[PDB]
Design a protein around this ligand. Structure first.
Ligand SMILES: Nc1nc2c(ncn2[C@@H]2O[C@H](COP(=O)(O)O[C@H]3[C@@H](O)[C@H](n4ccc(=O)[nH]c4=O)O[C@@H]3CO)[C@H]3CC(O)(O)C[C@H]32)c(=O)[nH]1
Ligand code: NA
Length: 396
């Protein structure tokens, strides 16, 4: 019996059920969420959370949009910072501390990101950082150190690619991969509060990827996740969400490494994109539903729940207390990758929290990166188009 079967049963015998719409399609993240919910439901007296899978995160936002039109929101959902900004336009969200959920010791990297007009509207739950995944076997084979700088990263990819006869830096042509290169070549999306997609650092970042493809050291992955493509051709590195850890581990036929991101200099690791989601609570939910939300959120923020979630998935523990939990400690003592993910979570950048950001990152920025990388569109012309489309979307 799967944990979602156990939850369906707990929920059947409950007098209040708080629905939690999420965007986990399976693997470790879906299992860890459900296991956490099973445990919460068991300590309650007929008060339950029902996790409802809505597809991926994009399917999730579309389902929540539909929910607003219909006037039937769930009690909780996962949200990106930009989803929070959008739901706040609708005034759809309960201030988190109005529930009496205590947030002291939540990492300010995550807590800052859920604060709008000084008010916290989300609980950091499943927060990821990009890390460098690598093939320790293939690097040892050719005597190539883990690269510490972007310069060493490009040299390693070129040297390994020539040795193995194939592009060893694997990347998705998407906003998430672009963010790593953009941020770490000095880029910033907002200039005096205006969204700029076509700055010289944008052009430089997209050019580096496109030159990578031409020169034969960067391999665009067009079909499924990087971890879904492992096994065809030599692989040295990717830059990818920490929540892909269990996916990399299950798929890898080689000894998997995790490192901090290459930076401009050895003085500091590069910045990683913060991804995954916060839990929000909808004004429309009943007093009783909101009360279960309140208890669920205190449970999810407990050191044990965060320790178990983070060690099962590769997400970043969102609390100082999680790091002092002995379950976390015992995982970290036998697996240094958990410390690597925490170390990398210190060098952490967000995309803009604009209501329209979801549409822009996929259908505009995402497209322009695909045009340059897959159709050999001029990097600057592809981003000049993106800038034009985003300004049309954002205008007035
Ligand atoms: N809607 C919307 N999505 C957004 C936004 N910002 C970023 N993202 C997407 O967040 C994903 C990273 O979030 P994360 O929770 O760190 O990782 C996910 C999965 O990515 C990852 N996974 C799943 C299957 C698999 O084979 N491998 C694997 O690594 O496991 C986790 C649960 O699904 C990226 C994925 C993307 O959709 O291509 C674009 C990115 C936004 O603002 N809105
Ligand atoms: Na999955």
């Amino acid at each position: 019996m799967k944990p979602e079967d156990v939850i369906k049963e707990q929920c059947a015998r409950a007098k209040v059920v708080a629905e939690l719409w999420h965007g986990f399609t399976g693997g470790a993240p879906k299992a860890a969420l459900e296991n956490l919910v099973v445990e919460f439901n068991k300590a309650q007296q007929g008060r339950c959370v029902r996790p409802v899978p809505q597809g991926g995160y994009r399917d999730l936002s579309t389902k929540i949009k539909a929910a607003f039109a219909a006037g039937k929101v769930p009690t909780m959902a996962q949200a990106f910072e930009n989803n929070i900004a959008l739901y706040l336009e609708a005034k759809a969200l309960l201030p988190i501390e109005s529930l009496g959920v205590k947030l002291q010791g939540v990492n300010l990297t995550f807590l800052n990101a859920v604060r709008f007009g000084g008010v916290v509207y989300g609980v950091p739950f499943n927060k990821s950082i990009q890390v460098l995944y690598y093939n320790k076997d293939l690097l040892k084979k050719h005597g190539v150190p883990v690269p510490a700088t972007l310069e060493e990263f490009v040299a390693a990819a070129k040297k390994l690619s020539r040795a193995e006869g194939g592009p060893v830096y694997w990347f998705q042509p998407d906003a998430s991969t672009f963010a790593y290169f953009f941020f770490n070549l000095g880029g910033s999306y907002l200039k005096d509060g205006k969204l700029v997609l076509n700055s010289k650092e944008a052009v430089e970042a997209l050019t580096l990827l496109q030159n990578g493809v031409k020169e034969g050291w960067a391999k665009p992955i067009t079909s499924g996740a990087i971890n879904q493509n492992l096994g065809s051709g030599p692989y040295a590195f990717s830059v990818d969400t920490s929540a892909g850890y269990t996916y990399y581990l299950r798929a890898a036929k080689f000894d998997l490494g995790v490192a901090t991101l290459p930076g401009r200099t050895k003085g500091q690791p590069g910045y990683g994109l913060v991804q995954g989601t916060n839990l929000v609570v909808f004004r429309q939910a009943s007093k009783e539903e909101q009360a279960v939300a309140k208890d669920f959120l205190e449970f999810v923020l407990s050191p044990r729940a965060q320790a178990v979630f983070a060690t099962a998935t590769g997400y970043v523990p969102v609390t100082e207390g999680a790091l002092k939990d002995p379950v976390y400690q015992a995982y970290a003592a036998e697996n240094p990758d958990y410390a690597t993910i925490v170390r990398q979570s210190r060098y952490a950048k967000f995309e803009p929290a604009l209501a329209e950001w979801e549409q822009i990152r996929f259908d505009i920025l995402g497209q322009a990166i695909k045009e340059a990388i897959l159709n050999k569109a001029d990097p600057k012309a592809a981003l000049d188009r993106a800038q034009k489309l985003a300004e049309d979307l954002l205008s007035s």
